[PDB]
Amino acid sequence: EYKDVETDKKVKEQLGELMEPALGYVVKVPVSQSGVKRTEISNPEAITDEDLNKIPNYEIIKGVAYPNYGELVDKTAAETMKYVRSGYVIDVYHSGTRDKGYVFYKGITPSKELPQGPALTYQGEWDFTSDANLNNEEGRPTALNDDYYTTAIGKRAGLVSGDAKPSKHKYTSQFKVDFATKKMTGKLSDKEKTIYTVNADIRGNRFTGSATASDKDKGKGASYNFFSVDSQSLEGGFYGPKAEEMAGKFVADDKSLFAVFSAKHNASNVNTVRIIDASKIDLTNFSISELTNFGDASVLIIDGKKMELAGSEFTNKHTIDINGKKMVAVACCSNLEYMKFGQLWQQTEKQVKDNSLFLQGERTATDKMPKDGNYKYIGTWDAQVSKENNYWVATADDDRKAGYRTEFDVDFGSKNLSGKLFDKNGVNPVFTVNAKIDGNGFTGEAKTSDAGFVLNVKFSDVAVSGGFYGPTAAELGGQFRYQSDNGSVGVGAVFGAKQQVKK
Ligand code: NA
Secondary structure: OEEEOOOOOOOOOOOOOOOOOOOEEEEEOOEOOOOOOEEOOOOOEEEOOOOOOOOOOHHHHHHHHOOOOOOEEEEOOOOOOOOEEEEEEEEOOOOOOOOOEEEEEEEOOEOOEEEEOOOEEEEEEEEEEEOEEOOOOOOOOEOOOOOEOOOEOOOOEOOEHHHEOOOOOOEEEEEEEEOOOOEEEEEEEEOOEEEEEEEEEEEOOEEEEEEEEOOOOOOOHHHOOOOOOOEEEEEEEEEOOOOOEEEEEEEOOOOOEEEEEEEEEOOOOOEEEEOEEEEEEEOOOOOEEEOOOOOOOOEEEEOOEEEEOOOOOOEEEEEEEEOOEEEEEEEEOOOOOOEEEEEEEEEOOOOEEEEEEEEEEEEOOOOOOOOOOEEEEEEEEEEEEEEOOEEEEEOOOOOOOOOOEEEEEEEOOOOEEEEEEOOOOOOOOOEEEEEEEEOOEEEEEEEOOOOOEOOOEOOOOEEEEEEEEOOOOOEEEEEEEEEEOOOOEEEEEEEEEEEEEEO
């Protein structure tokens, strides 16, 4: 009597290779080997690290400069930022063909909640390394002992911002960000002069755009402008639980300059709506952890590496190898486009280590949420109930008749939600859910049958949290976890359901 609502597929926007999101990026300062005349900015290496106080490839440049009688200096902006770092680590007494250092940015906890209201002003700093260019036609200067500590400016080795004297140069960054229009503007300035202007569109908790140069004229000699070329590849992200901070980068179009930046807003009374759900329930501790997500629920991020969850069938298995070590995940479903839920474990031996459930979803815009209507949501769920050492496991399927089903009555009018979570070939539901709808989410309680559920296990009022996903809120997802005695009985469960149309 019910079938899935005809929905338009999620529009796939192909990025370009320099616009792939990550926790951070790092670039080795260009040093022209011999007898190369021009060494361009190489490809930015992605950072998969969640340690802020760790500078990328620090031990390498350290090991290079010191036996060569050099001294390291690092600007990471750790003195002012909480969730982000940006800047450099370079060799002050660099000469010759040995490595000079790195220019980078990184951040932790990409935002799942964005501010709501007026545009925000983020303030911070930016840094940069230039390409290396020996050619005399280029006309890069020699001996500007008033501006830089360095004799040959960007010739054998790139010009880093740390080579400049503070007496004459301060590189500041300022951005104005509207999360409503999902738009961003800003300026990268030296002292009071505007070097770059930046434009960007916000998608998820990332932003992609361009940096236009204020001074297009390259010039020559002591009047050489290292910031004449634009960049159509500015990419960054918001960090902090509520987009408290932001960091990013851009590479010049002719790869003559690579610039990084970090900034933070000071705003007083910031209201936040949620945009991203990404959670992981551990099926042993029954504790819950946040997953790193950038606004694509069909992509799971573990230890920094990327595993895509979408596939050709209803539920798809995907396997990836990370630092530790080989990870497997089963993801559902194929009819869900703005959310993904499933299982996630590590395949050590037959056995599984770190068994888990996960739920990701791209929240429905708070203004896109229906205010009137009464709908039906049919879907499925993954779960694990366990008293002592015997287990009951729910595994997502497409058997709408007699599988692990989830049925939901949703009234946007009264803002009420009810749900039934079934076992395979079960007439009466194992779990019943009663939740209240607020904004683009719902919070409520789950209870067993009034007589109990035997693997006997019985409990009432376990905290259930969920949300509506997609532009039309035609998809909903949720989760609940609980344990007693710490820990005798445990329950972990995640569910998903699609909006239905009759007949
Ligand atoms: Na503040």
